[PDB]
Structure 1
């Protein structure tokens, strides 16, 4: 089954998921000199005050922090979005070394990691119905660079020991995702896809310009995770990122 290695990685995904060669695939390179300021974009509203995390899961490719989305709590609206999108989970993509890890790139620059906060459009009733629509999802993308520690990330970091191998989960209630946001909300936005199979083209991407800093010690703990299940040969969970895909004359808009 699909992964990130030589034999099941991004170059292979098209065989089981033909949309891998589609018209609105993610991630993409953000050419800052081609992206245009869009005066018509409303302000972005990120309302994560009443967010309810439930648990953290190693799913064999990354870890998902999952939220209770059975009610309008943590919501994304404004910007390029119409209506309300509900936070369902967040996860990261990261590298084996600080010079790679992000999915989106900025003028070809790769960051050490990238955070994806995944939201589904409430007009569609549930996540499963949302992923059958071109405007079903909104993902908030936040770059990670290595420098000073991110205090709001440390609760995630310390729990990773308990979810080392594929299929392990842990109770992870009362996590506040506001602690992962950079100061500025300037962003780029384009229509795209989820970056893991089935790579559904349902996403309005909102990628923040300002990276957060995490410490080397913090990213190193990400890298101690396992792709394999308990008691199998150890495959370190690293380089779980899909490279940049053809823009196919979509248009990236700047909020600034």
Structure 2
């Protein structure tokens, strides 16, 4: 009886195995755009993905992860609200059973169809597992997806999904360029938060881009054909793998714009 996205083991249950679920800096949150403070001291975000080395894609039973070589300083995030350098380790998405829901963060209570998370760890901690034990260990770049035009840069991810349909499947996935998933503007909101799945650790500086990317209906339909179950188990479609907005508590969301 492990955690998941149901009935009986979904977000509303996670606190019993992971009591930090009711902590003081949990994510995601609703971004109330009127009460986010513009902060002129924030810097432009610096995304340097020109040497990124993707390796593999994995269905982990909750989502799929596209994983990167993070053994050298090759795909890094810095600037923005960050001190120091953060190295890309993986990206993944959260999405819905319908186009009207699927994002984790919301904007004035608006849900997007999905949300991409590019996960980076602070190099001052040497590796991901030590970084998640620190309050400034990770920086997660979150990007909303709406359904409209296709995203050509997403298609190579969509096409490999039938090879990793069920939990525990992986496939070679080299030469994937995550620059092809970025919108045109890097204007962002930022606040201190947490991983949005167990272990729910309070180690993340969240950076949420204002401008969503568009993906097609056919692209998001292929996400919804994945499965949470393993091969030879009854089919449980991988949909609605998002945690709802959590209490903001004693936190300020800052805007890099306006």
Q: TM-score range by the shorter chain?
A: over 0.9
1:81-130 deviation line (CA, Å, top 9, x unaligned): 00000000000000000000000000000000000000000000000110
Matches within 5 A, 1:28-177: 28-177=29-178
Secondary structure of 2:218's match? helix
Secondary structure of 2:197's match? coil
Give the Cα–Cα distance (whole angstroms) in 1 for the partners of residues 43 and 147 of structure 2. 31
Aligned to 1:239: 240
Give the Cα–Cα distance (whole angstroms) in 2 for the partners of residues 221 and 204 of structure 1. 30
Aligned CA-pair RMSD: 0.3
Shift of 1:26: 0.2
Shift of 1:32: 0.1
Secondary structure of 1:12's match? helix
Q: How many residues align?
A: 256
Give the Cα–Cα distance (whole angstroms) in 1 for the partners of residues 215 and 45 of structure 2. 24
Give the Cα–Cα distance (whole angstroms) in 2 for the partners of residues 220 and 43 of structure 1. 34
Secondary structure of 2:34's match? coil
Give the Cα–Cα distance (whole angstroms) in 2 for the partners of residues 38 and 88 of structure 1. 29
Secondary structure of 2:160's match? helix
Give the Cα–Cα distance (whole angstroms) in 1 for the partners of residues 154 and 44 of structure 2. 26
Tell me if structure 1 keeps the 8 A contact 2:24–2:250.
no
Give the Cα–Cα distance (whole angstroms) in 2 for the partners of residues 181 and 51 of structure 1. 14
Relative to the length of structure 1, the TM-score reads 1.00
Tell me if structure 1 keeps the 8 A contact 2:44–2:186.
no
Secondary structure of 2:28's match? coil
1:228-256 deviation line (CA, Å, top 9, x unaligned): 00010000000000000000020000000
Shift of 1:16: 0.2
Secondary structure of 1:141's match? strand
Tell me if structure 1 keeps the 8 A contact 2:96–2:241.
yes
Shift of 1:178: 0.1
1:211-231 deviation line (CA, Å, top 9, x unaligned): 000000000000000000001
1:141-166 deviation line (CA, Å, top 9, x unaligned): 00000000000000000000000000
Q: Which runs of 5+ in 1 are unaligned?
A: none
Aligned to 1:25: 26
Shift of 1:42: 1.4
